[PDB]
Design a protein around this ligand. Sequence first.
Ligand SMILES: CP(=O)(O)N[C@@H]1[C@@H](O)[C@H](O)[C@@H](COP(=O)(O)O)O[C@@H]1O
Ligand SMILES: CP(=O)(O)N[C@@H]1[C@@H](O)[C@H](O)[C@@H](COP(=O)(O)O)O[C@@H]1O
Ligand SMILES: [Zn+2]
Ligand SMILES: [Zn+2]
Lengths: 382, 382
Amino acid sequence: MYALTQGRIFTGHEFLDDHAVVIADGLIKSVCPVAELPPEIEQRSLNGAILSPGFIDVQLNGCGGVQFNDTAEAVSVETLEIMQKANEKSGCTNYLPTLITTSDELMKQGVRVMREYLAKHPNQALGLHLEGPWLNLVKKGTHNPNFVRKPDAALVDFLCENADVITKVTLAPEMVPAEVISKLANAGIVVSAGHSNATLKEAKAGFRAGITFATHLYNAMPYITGREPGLAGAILDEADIYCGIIADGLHVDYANIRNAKRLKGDKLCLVTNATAPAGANIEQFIFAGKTIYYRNGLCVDENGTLSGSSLTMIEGVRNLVEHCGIALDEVLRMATLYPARAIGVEKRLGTLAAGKVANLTAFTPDFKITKTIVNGNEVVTQ
Amino acid sequence: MYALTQGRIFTGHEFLDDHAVVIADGLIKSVCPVAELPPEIEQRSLNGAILSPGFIDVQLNGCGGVQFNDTAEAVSVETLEIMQKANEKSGCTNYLPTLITTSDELMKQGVRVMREYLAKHPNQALGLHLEGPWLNLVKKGTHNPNFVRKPDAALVDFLCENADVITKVTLAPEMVPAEVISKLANAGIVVSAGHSNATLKEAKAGFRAGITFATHLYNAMPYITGREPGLAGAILDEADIYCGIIADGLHVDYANIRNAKRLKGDKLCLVTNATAPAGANIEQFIFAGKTIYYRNGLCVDENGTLSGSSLTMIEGVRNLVEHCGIALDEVLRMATLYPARAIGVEKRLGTLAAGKVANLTAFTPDFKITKTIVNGNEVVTQ
Ligand SMILES: CP(=O)(O)N[C@@H]1[C@@H](O)[C@H](O)[C@@H](COP(=O)(O)O)O[C@@H]1O
Ligand SMILES: CP(=O)(O)N[C@@H]1[C@@H](O)[C@H](O)[C@@H](COP(=O)(O)O)O[C@@H]1O
Ligand SMILES: [Zn+2]
Ligand SMILES: [Zn+2]
């Protein structure tokens, strides 16, 4: 057992000074004044570093030089484990491996792989995020059109039956029957609107059917016009809908992120939507059946189409603070508590309180990771 | 002097019950509990109606069957007087006659006619609103393209010399040297961004140069995309910028109006941008050298291009309350206090307080005008 001391502790609700977090049995035992700490307990000094619950990334296609996409070879438990070690280097202790628009078979393997993974590693990769294939071609983005299709009773049923390892499914509401959304949500899956050209009216129908989240706000959505707010405008106008936003300063202009934060409040979540280049050093990689190039901080195919990002959660936190005028504590919530509540895991993750899983990360004022703790174990030490 | 009693009185800061507004010498003498009323003063009952500062419309091309545009014949003091009488019928006691993209000749005539009207009618038509001709053809809307032109140093200097009768000039910041903006602003003229295809970057440059207002948000502006917020996006992100919004449910979707209000706070002003059909009953009229038809409840030229509205201020107040979820008191401010502050006339108008000009309007809960008072005289009685 041990206690982390001498550092600013962010519980999710406030910053504490002169306190210590005692971690025992992979769980956070308590957070209280350092002066009430029993004697001889090994104290781990944070050395002034900020201590926060581990970041939670709800949209991640790949990182650490690998992708959990495209092939049966890459859609494996080993990939999941690799992506986890890479995330940890960036303070990210949890994520939703995201498998995009692909064949029925690859989706089934992804489900089997997720399930196998869960049995071996708890409180890490939390569950699958299936982005596709029920999208709108007009907003397919970098997805392979040969796989963008309409929903079948068989696939729909398979997902619902495997809801226990499927955290979320992103789909275009105007491309699927309301019944499909309701069925998925009733099974326990978070249904999110994304890669849609839906009008505001269509978007609202999707919300009423069971959609409670939206994938990477602005991206793969209609632009906003005076008379047609579209899905983006609808999400902004609907206080109950949570949503992710890629904060790399490349996918979305910081001004739109600021406007989005003001309008979404505690419902805006930080996501990386990263790819293999994130937390690694590579020049190119494969994605959506194409060759993607990492040229100038961008991940684009030969046609210049953005294909995911190379952003890490700690970099996202930093950008939101330095460029979007959002307080550190609020930014930390966008990367922890908010995404945790969006996917229903706040009872065990998202804050530094007694009983919660011991997943944390520590960084210095310059936003450099000094520690990362998974299930009470310090996997990163810098 | 006399007193208005028996009604809910909105001062611009609060709703008052059991109070009275005492009017003397065209000014509001006091707003106090009915118990402090001077002995034996005349008491005019509001019959339970709501009493408010008279509505101020900062963008109006025409109404009552006339237009303050297009021809040397129409640009007259008589038109201004006709428009004022029609406005009063819908609770609007003050407005800015808006002369759009036309020739140097007509503009100068507009300046002379305004000056002539001002020496004759105090506290009514406040001053000129020149919308154009330094706009972007991409966003000319219904404006005659043949007149959209670059800013001549001479014309600019002229406007500066006649700043005393020119309340506002709307221009596209990316089509004009920063100096033109600065000259006009320093001359006391409110410089507004409108009919522009400005990027967020070009818009901010405009604000730094002197722009403090934006004409009919969303309309004649770029749509909003993830990586290019454009002028509309920059306006929503800059708290210091005031802007008008056409609340007819026709020019801008109510969801966009709600998002804009949450982002602009006390900087969002209600405007009509109405034309001749407002407060009248016509099937067509001339505007921008074209025949405009009132089809399907819209003012459109033969090509379907929206060409102004047929909204009245009292109808706009109603729409904002019923379809935008904005409290009546806040909506009233959008039609009074806010626009008054935007054009710097709040020391004499915009609120019901001692010393302020006695311009007021009263209406029943169903938004029907019962009274309109200008300089202390009740000009509308219903
Ligand atoms: C794995 P993914 O989520 O599909 N990645 C998206 C791409 O498909 C889009 O092309 C890009 C731009 O979208 P845009 O609408 O052009 O802003 O945004 C994301 O990078
Ligand atoms: C007197 P005005 O201010 O010129 N009137 C504008 C028109 O020119 C535009 O065509 C219309 C639509 O603009 P839009 O960009 O299509 O929303 O909005 C206003 O009616
Ligand atoms: Zn996507
Ligand atoms: Zn206009």
